[PDB]
Amino acid sequence: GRKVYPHHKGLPNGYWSNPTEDRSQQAIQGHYQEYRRPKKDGLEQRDDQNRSVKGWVKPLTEFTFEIDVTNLSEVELGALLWLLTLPDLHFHRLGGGKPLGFGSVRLDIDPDKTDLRNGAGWRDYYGSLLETSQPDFTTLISQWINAFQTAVKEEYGSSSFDQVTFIKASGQSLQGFHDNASIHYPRSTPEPKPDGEAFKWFVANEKGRRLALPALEKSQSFPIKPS
Partner RNA sequence: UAUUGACGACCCCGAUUGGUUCUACUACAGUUUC
Q: Which residues of the chain form contacts with another protein (CB under 8 A)? A: 1-3, 5, 66, 68, 119, 122-123, 126-131
Instruction: Tell me how far apart the alpha carbons of residues 6 and 8 are, in angstroms, rounded to a whole number.
Output: 6
CA atoms within 13 A on the CB side of 198: 5
Interaction of residue 4 with RNA, rule CB under 7 A:
no
Residue 218 touches which of another protein, RNA, none (CB < 5 to 8 A by kind)? none
Which residue, 43 or 69, is less far from another protein as judged by CB?
Answer: 69
Which residue, 53 or 89, is less far from RNA as judged by CB?
Answer: 53
Which residue, 52 or 128, is less far from another protein as judged by CB?
Answer: 128
Interaction of residue 196 with RNA, rule CB under 7 A:
yes
Helices (H), the chain: 74-84, 119-125, 141-155, 165-175, 199-207
Interaction of residue 194 with RNA, rule CB under 7 A:
no
Interaction of residue 195 with RNA, rule CB under 7 A:
yes
CB neighbour class for 179 (10 Å; exposed up to 12, middle 13-18, buried from 19): exposed
Which residue, 38 or 78, is less far from RNA as judged by CB?
Answer: 38
Which residue, 118 or 158, is less far from another protein as judged by CB?
Answer: 118
Interaction of residue 203 with RNA, rule CB under 7 A:
yes
Task: Please report, to the nearest 10 degrees, the dihedral formed by the alpha carbons of residues 201, 202, 208, 214 taken in order.
Answer: 100
Residue 65, amino acid: F
Part of the chain binding RNA (CB under 7 A), chosen from 10-18, 52-60, 77-85, 196-204: 196-204
Write the CA distances from 162 to 73, 120, 165, 169, integer angstroms. Answer: 22, 33, 8, 9
CA atoms within 13 A on the CB side of 23: 18
CB neighbour class for 101 (10 Å; exposed up to 12, middle 13-18, buried from 19): buried
Among 200, 209, 218, 225, the residue binding RNA under the rule CB under 7 A is 200
- Stated length of the chain: 227
Interaction of residue 185 with RNA, rule CB under 7 A:
no
Min CB(160)–another protein separation in Å: 26
Min CB(129)–another protein separation in Å: 4
Residue ranges binding RNA (CB under 7 A): 48-49, 51, 195-200, 203, 207
